[PDB]
Amino acid sequence: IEALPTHIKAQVLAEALPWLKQLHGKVVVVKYGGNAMTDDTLRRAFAADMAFLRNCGIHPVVVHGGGPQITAMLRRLGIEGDFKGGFRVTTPEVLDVARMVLFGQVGRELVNLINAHGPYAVGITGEDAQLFTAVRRSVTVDGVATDIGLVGDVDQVNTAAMLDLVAAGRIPVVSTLAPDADGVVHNINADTAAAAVAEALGAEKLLMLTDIDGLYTRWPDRDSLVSEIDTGTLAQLLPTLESGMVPKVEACLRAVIGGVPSAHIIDGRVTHCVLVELFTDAGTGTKVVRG
Amino acid sequence: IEALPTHIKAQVLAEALPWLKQLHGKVVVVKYGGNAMTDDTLRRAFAADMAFLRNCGIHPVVVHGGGPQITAMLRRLGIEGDFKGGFRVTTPEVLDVARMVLFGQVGRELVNLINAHGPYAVGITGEDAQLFTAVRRSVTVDGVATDIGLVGDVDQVNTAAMLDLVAAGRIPVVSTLAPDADGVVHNINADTAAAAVAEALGAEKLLMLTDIDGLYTRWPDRDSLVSEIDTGTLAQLLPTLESGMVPKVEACLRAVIGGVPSAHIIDGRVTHCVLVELFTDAGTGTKVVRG
Amino acid sequence: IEALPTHIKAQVLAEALPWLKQLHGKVVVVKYGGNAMTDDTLRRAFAADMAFLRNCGIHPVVVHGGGPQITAMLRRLGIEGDFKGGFRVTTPEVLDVARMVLFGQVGRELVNLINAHGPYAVGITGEDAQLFTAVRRSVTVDGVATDIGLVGDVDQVNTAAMLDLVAAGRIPVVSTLAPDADGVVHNINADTAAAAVAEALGAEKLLMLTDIDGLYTRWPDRDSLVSEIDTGTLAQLLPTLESGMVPKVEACLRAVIGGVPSAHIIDGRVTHCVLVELFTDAGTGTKVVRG
Amino acid sequence: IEALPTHIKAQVLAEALPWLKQLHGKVVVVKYGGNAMTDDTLRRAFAADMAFLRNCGIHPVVVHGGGPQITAMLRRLGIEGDFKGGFRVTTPEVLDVARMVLFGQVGRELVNLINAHGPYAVGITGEDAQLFTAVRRSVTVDGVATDIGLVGDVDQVNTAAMLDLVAAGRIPVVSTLAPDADGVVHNINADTAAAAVAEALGAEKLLMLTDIDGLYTRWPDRDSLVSEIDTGTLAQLLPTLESGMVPKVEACLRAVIGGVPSAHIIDGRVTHCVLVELFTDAGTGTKVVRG
Amino acid sequence: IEALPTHIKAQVLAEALPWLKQLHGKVVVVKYGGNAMTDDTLRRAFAADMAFLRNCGIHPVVVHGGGPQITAMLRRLGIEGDFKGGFRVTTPEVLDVARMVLFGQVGRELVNLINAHGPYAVGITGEDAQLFTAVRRSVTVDGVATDIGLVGDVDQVNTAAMLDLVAAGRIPVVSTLAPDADGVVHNINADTAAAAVAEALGAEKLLMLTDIDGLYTRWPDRDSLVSEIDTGTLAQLLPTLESGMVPKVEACLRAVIGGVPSAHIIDGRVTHCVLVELFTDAGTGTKVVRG
Amino acid sequence: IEALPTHIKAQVLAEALPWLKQLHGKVVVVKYGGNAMTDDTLRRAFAADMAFLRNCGIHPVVVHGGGPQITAMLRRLGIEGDFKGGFRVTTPEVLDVARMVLFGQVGRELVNLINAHGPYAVGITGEDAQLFTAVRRSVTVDGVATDIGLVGDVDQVNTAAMLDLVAAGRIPVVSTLAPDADGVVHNINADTAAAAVAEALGAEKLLMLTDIDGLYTRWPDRDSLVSEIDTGTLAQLLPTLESGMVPKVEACLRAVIGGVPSAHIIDGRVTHCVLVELFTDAGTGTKVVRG
Ligand SMILES: CN1CCN(c2ccc(C(=O)O)cc2)CC1
Ligand SMILES: CN1CCN(c2ccc(C(=O)O)cc2)CC1
Ligand SMILES: CN1CCN(c2ccc(C(=O)O)cc2)CC1
Known part of the structure; x- marks a missing residue:
């Protein structure tokens, strides 16, 4: 990854700064499961990402x-x-x-x-x-x-x-x-439990690692996929969703309604998904906010 | 246990005072095993004794x-x-x-x-x-x-x-x-491991719960049983001892030589043996000190 | 006091545990007077009891x-x-x-x-x-x-x-x-003054050492003696009581009404009465609670 | 005391500054006795001076x-x-x-x-x-x-x-x-005892209130009076001195030799002598330093 | 300044005590300007006075x-x-x-x-x-x-x-x-700005160094000069005052109304005016309090 | 910069982790001068980089x-x-x-x-x-x-x-x-001064922003440029170097000899050079270590 110009390496690091500011000294609760837990390279990347947060003065x-x-x-x-x-x-x-x-x-x-x-x-x-x-x-x-x-x-x-x-x-x-x-x-x-811990700790963010790109509103329509949605709209779509998406969505609903600024459904199949979702605007996940 | 006169109940409590003084604010490492771990009433008494230490401001x-x-x-x-x-x-x-x-x-x-x-x-x-x-x-x-x-x-x-x-x-x-x-x-x-933790923490005492009255120097001679012995004398008797007493004695040796004031081989078959050994002079155990 | 079996010595110590829990880190104000102050063995026992409380992490x-x-x-x-x-x-x-x-x-x-x-x-x-x-x-x-x-x-x-x-x-x-x-x-x-200090410090208990077994409601009827009574009932009986019991009762009334969970009239003539009243249910005293 | 020009009132206050600097946050042990203890106006002035030190952040x-x-x-x-x-x-x-x-x-x-x-x-x-x-x-x-x-x-x-x-x-x-x-x-x-406390506390100064202007080396020769002397010279003159000056001098000797920078024999008959000796160079006392 | 008797030097120091008590541990905001800022001896006296406050445990x-x-x-x-x-x-x-x-x-x-x-x-x-x-x-x-x-x-x-x-x-x-x-x-x-800082910090006093003896209500009538006045009365006189006195008075008004106990217009032409105004009742300034 | 695949954006962030670990809670002294100080976009990038360090729990x-x-x-x-x-x-x-x-x-x-x-x-x-x-x-x-x-x-x-x-x-x-x-x-x-502050503060790194790619040993031979050198070798080459490189090299020498683990001559002409030098191995600078 060094055939990549060093001035674009600068830009990606510098583009993390506003998310470093937003999360410095803040709690982030991370629900960890699925494939990010069984593949060894995803696992090692998940652990390195937790160390990353900790060595930025963030509280995972x-x-x-x-x-x-x-x-x-x-x-x-x-x-x-x-x-x-x-x-x-x-x-x-x-x-x-x-x-x-x-x-x-x-x-x-x-x-x-x-x-x-x-x-x-x-x-x-x-x-x-x-x-x-x-x-x-x-x-x-x-x-x-x-x-x-x-x-x-x-x-x-x-x-x-x-x-x-x-x-x-x-x-x-x-x-x-x-x-x-x-x-x-x-x-x-x-x-x-992750939603409950997030709300009890006043977490800044809840991240939910799941094995999907994000929430599709009309699965499997490829362009039903959202990147952001509010609790009111998410609550209405929930009895429509797939069996295994229900708990991940209910947790987000509960957390964000409980005062957690945002909850995120991100793809555990992506190496360093945590880093991508927190410190980059190219996230595949879907962000849940109150509304 | 209330057909027992209340002025003797006073005396047993008051007789704990010098051991409360000696252990207030001090670490006590307790190796817990054997029958004190499988019988439910011994187990519940062991747990209550740990709470006792904690509610005296002792650090078990x-x-x-x-x-x-x-x-x-x-x-x-x-x-x-x-x-x-x-x-x-x-x-x-x-x-x-x-x-x-x-x-x-x-x-x-x-x-x-x-x-x-x-x-x-x-x-x-x-x-x-x-x-x-x-x-x-x-x-x-x-x-x-x-x-x-x-x-x-x-x-x-x-x-x-x-x-x-x-x-x-x-x-x-x-x-x-x-x-x-x-x-x-x-x-x-x-x-x-208990001996190593005791020495690393500067413990005041190491207690070793085992299923025996105490160390016998010539098992099974009933009157070979000791209540106190020093590291030098204990070291010499160790290749004489029974198979399962070896690890409990080696741990005591190492701990007391490592600077832990005393280590104790006490009988886990006795309800509240911890309380008896620490806050009473009627202990059945054997105390190991340096010498 | 060692002709007493060591497994009953265990039981009396273990029976103190719930009162150690209730008083750990708590203030106890002790009015000290009467014979517990003039006999040397009662005095030395009173002082040892104060050291006891202190070496349990209690605040006498x-x-x-x-x-x-x-x-x-x-x-x-x-x-x-x-x-x-x-x-x-x-x-x-x-x-x-x-x-x-x-x-x-x-x-x-x-x-x-x-x-x-x-x-x-x-x-x-x-x-x-x-x-x-x-x-x-x-x-x-x-x-x-x-x-x-x-x-x-x-x-x-x-x-x-x-x-x-x-x-x-x-x-x-x-x-x-x-x-x-x-x-x-x-x-x-x-x-x-002891009642006032107890209430100002948020004491858990006020103990009043006096020279009597406890409050008798119809002195000297031997079976008028109570072990517990509430402020409302105690207030009514007060103009009935003996001259010297008035101040000890008024102090209890004021203290318990002031928010001190319980006040105790205990017998200063008993060696280690403090220990008996706090860490034993065989107390001779009378406990005052609100009601 | 207000027929005194206000610009000289300024100068006396401003002249205290180097002694405020030297004593801020420092211990000063004050032996208090003699007439500064029996006359009511001297007593009230002594107490006000202790409050003065305390309200300068000095530790009397x-x-x-x-x-x-x-x-x-x-x-x-x-x-x-x-x-x-x-x-x-x-x-x-x-x-x-x-x-x-x-x-x-x-x-x-x-x-x-x-x-x-x-x-x-x-x-x-x-x-x-x-x-x-x-x-x-x-x-x-x-x-x-x-x-x-x-x-x-x-x-x-x-x-x-x-x-x-x-x-x-x-x-x-x-x-x-x-x-x-x-x-x-x-x-x-x-x-x-004052000398011992001064040395144990690392006091900056020991002041000894006595009823005399200061140490005379040839009492009663009026011009044998000193304002400063060292431990070596003071030690030699001590068997020459009056009965009651012995303890005040021995205390100074011991204190200054013990590491207390200076000890002072000041006149307790003067109102606010403490203030005069500490915050003014017009002190009547005698200062003892090591030498 | 030592042709001045040492017992009057005592009295001036001792007369500072109530103002030391009132200001110990308190903030004092000092607006510094005018001639106290251009003459070198006034400047050095201003700086020494700030050190004085600091070495009394006051917070200038x-x-x-x-x-x-x-x-x-x-x-x-x-x-x-x-x-x-x-x-x-x-x-x-x-x-x-x-x-x-x-x-x-x-x-x-x-x-x-x-x-x-x-x-x-x-x-x-x-x-x-x-x-x-x-x-x-x-x-x-x-x-x-x-x-x-x-x-x-x-x-x-x-x-x-x-x-x-x-x-x-x-x-x-x-x-x-x-x-x-x-x-x-x-x-x-x-x-x-000094008034705003004084109010934001909960200052005990605001001192305003200006080049005048104090506020005259009918300048230049020599006996229109006041030593104390309240906010209500000062507010009414303000459109009467000289051009350069307006900002110093508005600052006092705002500060004292904002909760600062008193604000002071003192003469910066006087050496150690700060010391005179704070630790002496012979102050030339004018004190503003709420009313 | 988003036509760049998001999985390479991950890799650059994740590659910063070992340098985040090395610098968390550590002092980094940054000499700031030259063109990184006169061009507005370099300036704003320098300031954002200082905020970056601070929001990683690093002490710039x-x-x-x-x-x-x-x-x-x-x-x-x-x-x-x-x-x-x-x-x-x-x-x-x-x-x-x-x-x-x-x-x-x-x-x-x-x-x-x-x-x-x-x-x-x-x-x-x-x-x-x-x-x-x-x-x-x-x-x-x-x-x-x-x-x-x-x-x-x-x-x-x-x-x-x-x-x-x-x-x-x-x-x-x-x-x-x-x-x-x-x-x-x-x-x-x-x-x-930057070298002296770095050594006095126990800094982990000293960075010297200068207007050059790095130290050339035989300027202007393009391939005399080094990426790392030790104090002993750097000391010998110093009387060979250009006028303006002398102070930047002397500072590095002094700092690293003074115990600062490494000093860095990095190119202030590069946007976010600090970020590049600290969190990337594609740095253009030259690192000075002891030897
Ligand atoms: C000493 N290490 C290991 C245990 N850590 C814990 C674990 C659990 C708890 C708790 O549940 O209260 C606290 C610290 C602290 C750091
Ligand atoms: C130094 N020892 C003796 C004095 N002790 C006291 C005594 C009184 C007070 C007070 O009344 O504030 C505080 C500490 C503290 C421990
Ligand atoms: C280290 N010294 C010099 C700087 N001082 C300051 C200066 C400014 C600030 C601030 O504005 O927060 C704090 C400390 C503290 C003492």
Whole structure:
């Protein structure tokens, strides 16, 4: 990449300046999942980008999922699943496995990758110092809300204690599990939890890494793809969208309505997508603002 | 326990005062393992004791093992073991399982138990913010030192960052895994790691919970049991001792020689053994001091 | 006290934990007087208990009286008293003697006793750094309110400066004298002053050491003795009570109504009564809460 | 004092500037005794001068004696004295009286006077928070050193804790009593104690208020009076001097040799002598420097 | 000045005490101009007085003008002026000259004079760290408001950042220039700017050095001179006053109405006028208070 | 610059990461002069680059010259010069002009440019709070060292006070003038002063903006141009070099020998040269390291 003239290398760096100003000293919550989590070069680029933010004096917070890895581990352990609708029931046994995979495996790899750049990453869950709690969630199947075991939503968040972590120069890598009011640990959808953390921390931005170019309003019409949309318009289009886009959009809606200036659906398939979305106007993502 | 006269209840509390003075504001590293970790009433008493220390303004640090749980998980996963001497070889696969069980299961339960008393516990490993590193260890089998994979000793310790944690009112619950100088995570014997943490943190005391009354010099002679011994005398008796007492004694030796005022082999089978050993002179344990 | 099984010694210590949690980092104001002040073993136990609180990270504040010692000194000096009702008139001369005995004798002994356990105690009065002021009080004799010289009530309190003292790890030992708005030092009833300090400091508890088992509602009916009562019910019973119980009850009323969660009338004749009342449910005292 | 031209009032103020520079943020220990302590207008001027120092951001520390007041109180109490040489033996009884008069009477008046200008003064002794200790002293009578009871010299000083007091904006008013290594409180000559405090605190100046114009080398030759002298020359002249000048000179010697830049023997009979000696070159005192 | 008795030197110093108390830790804004700025002995006395305030723990802030020096420099550079009414039009060229003379010459001399007493003075303008902004002002000539170029009023003030400067022990020496909302630097009348800084900083006093004894209500009637007046009465007399007294009075009005306890018109022709006005009741100035 | 593929824009940003890590929290002293100071687009790019560093949590310090502007002002004022060798003699008059142009004109423009991006820049000289001093320098003409008036070298530097400035988030813009030990302000060569500031502040890098591609060892041989060289080799080549390269090389030598890890001669004619040199390996400059 050095057959590229050095005066255009200058221009791309200098063009980052207004976004460096906007984010210096600010929290950015990054939902990390999908292919940016399974391909090794995307993974290493994601970790380097978190170190980038940290070495600009920005405060990244990383929230991660791990759906497929849990399924794989349960199959290896021969744990037979129960399914209501399209949902696995989270028995105490499935939770133990989920937590052990999310916190003891998926979070650990990301911590080590990030820490290749310095002593930055620290892994946590709602359980650690009671950072946050969960409330049991029901899901709606075939019209009826119903119980699927120990799954929840983020209840309340120790905002102060988390902000201390990032001001110390740490990158929290959050595994979405947390105790309920009775001390019973639930598993939390990582997309929703990221929106809840973003709003509780007064984040400047929420980034949602997904495996798509961005939100299409009439998928698969190629020119239905938007680069920016407001909460009011996004709320109306949501019952139109594909199954897997629902949680990423609901999280954005909730976050931006909760006061987070903007939320972003960006393409995790692009190397250094974080860098592209934050420090460049050539972003493929779609930006959600209030309106 | 109230058929007991209230003026003797006074005397037992008042008799704790000199040990409260000696430990106020001081670090105490507690190696936690054995039966105090599998029986639920001993477990709940261990957690309540950590909260006790914390609510006296003492700084407990908890180091935990989990040998049998790892074995059980490997069998469930059908992972065939390789054995040199009496040692399982820690392949990258066994390490992934070990870390996932130690940090994602065993540490999590203790964090939640402790946190039933308040937002105190926080789980970590050498990986988090590069708190400590490992160096690969060899073991000696049938006379010859030899490789058994990704097992190590604690190399160096970010003393400052850990002391910050405890001064914030947190109880670190340490799972003994850490990266080597190249970022490759090793598993560390929990007994040795506790001694290394104790010495690096300038701990006032190291407590080693084991399943025995204390050190017997001529096991099983009932009256060979000691209540106190010095490093010089303990060093000489060590090649005499039982297989499983070796690591607990080596850790004490190393810790006390490293400047930790005293190390204690106490009986994990006793409810609230920590409270008994620290705040009472009726301790069953054996105290190791330098000499 | 070691013919007592060590597993019951554990249980009494472990039973203190919820009261350690409730009082960690909290102010406790202790009115100290009566026999707990004249018998040497009770005195030494009172001082050791203050060191106990301090070495649990609790913030004890000690308020003391000294009625009889003042009388004795005035007789030694041949100072003839004037009496209205049952009250000595506090001339400037009597105040000089009172202050010199309270601050220069009674407070000093307690400071030295406490300091046998460490550099904790510090003696003060309203005069020092203008910590608190007094307003002249009148008393009612035979129906008529009337002047008895330089006696007062605590007027206002430098809450901030006192809290600094205890956060520095100090135990203030307060002699109840303070200047009025014109700089004229008055003597203050120690019971009332303790209630005023408790309320001004946001104390968690006020303990009143007196020479009785507790409040009897129909003295001397043995089974009129209560262990808990509310302000509304206590207010109604007050004109029924014995002469010397009035100030201890009024102080409790005022304190608990002022927002102090509970006030306690405990028996100063019991060694380590403080320890018994705070860290044990076998307390002989009576607890006052709002209602 | 306003028949004085306003442009000469300017000049006297402006002439204080170099001494304000030299003492800003510095400790000045002031031994206060003699007539500056018994005449009310001198007393009020002494207190106003301490407030002056404090309101220039200077850190005054006041050490006081009280010999005659102790004698008067002992006579009032009919306490028969024992005398070796010219020294009263300090029995435990005499100490109780001494402490009660120094701390409970003499110190209190000065605290209240100073506090007429603000919440500045705070009274203390070696006993409070173990600020300093004493070691038993013997005196030499008719050639032989001998015991005179509970009299001592300042042993060691909690330099840090005292400096905290003055940085908080407080004026410590010290009564010279302190515990020995066994907790037994001794009385300390106020002149010597002031020198010891000055040296322990790194004071910039020690001022010794005495009832004389200054040191005369050949008393009563009017022109033997000096305004400045060095430790070497002062040490040689000391066995020549009057009985009561010995302690004031020994204190200066010890202080200046201990590293205190200068010590000053100034006339307590002059209103606002402190102000004259510190902020004016027309001082009557004598300055001691090292040489 | 030493043919003056030393006991009257005491009295003048001691008479400063209540003004030291009133100003300790307080901001005093000093408009410095006129003859106190051109005569070298008045200048050196002004600088020594700023050091005096600083070495009493007072926080002086110095605002300075420099009208005549700008005129002289423009003539030296042959810059032809344009005049509307009696006002020079401030072209970009005149501003460059003004700023370069005010900040690069007049402010520098005062900084160096003050710094002869220590590392205190620091020169600044609205431009530095955006300490304050300007808004373009129009003037009224022959009845009509009209533009005279890049002249303004102080718009808003970074109160926090300035208070940090003085708490660090610095003396800001302010040259009255500042950017408007678009970054265009304007020149500001120093009298008005001093009033604006005084009000923004919560100053205790504003002193206005001018070349007159004080405000005369019927100049030149010798006994129309006042020593104190309120804002309501001063506002009514203002359209009566001389041309050059208008800005000094308007600044006082605005400041005292803005909450500054008092503003003072004092005679810059008097050596150490600052010292006389602040620490003496023989001040020639006139004090403005609200009413 | 958006006809450039967005995945190469990513790569240039991501390639800055190791230099962000190396400079986060570090001082970088930037000598700013030449054409990067007279062309408006280079100037605006220089200011934006200083804001860039600041919004990465880097601590830029800007040192500036202004030779030609001083000459122009002296000619406008008709100040006749005296010349020894090729040096103007700096009379007190020339110094007044120099300081007024450097601090009151050249520094002010840069402060305002930088401040277009935020409240960052602050202008200073050695005079402000005595930040640094000068010692009079002589120059050597035709073999003989000789006096050229009030020109000097940086003597000593208040390292602490400057580091406070940058930690507050400020960009100091230094005009190289400072008082000597007697308070007499001298003018200092900006190249040398930048090296002295770099060494006194423990700077990570010194950048020297000059109008050349870099150091040529055999100018004008096109392929004598180096990209890196050590102090030992650079010292030997220095008497070979062009007149104007001498000060830029001497400054580098002194700085790197003084412990500054590297000094850089970079081309001020390139837009955003700072960004290119720090965050890119395509730098045209030459790096000086010790050897
Ligand atoms: C010492 N390192 C590792 C742990 N880090 C944590 C982890 C968790 C928490 C918490 O949940 O409160 C705080 C610090 C701090 C830096
Ligand atoms: C230095 N020790 C002794 C005095 N202590 C006091 C005493 C009184 C006050 C006050 O009344 O403000 C503060 C500290 C602090 C610790
Ligand atoms: C380091 N010295 C010189 C500069 N001083 C300043 C100057 C300006 C500012 C500002 O305008 O923010 C702060 C400190 C601080 C002390």
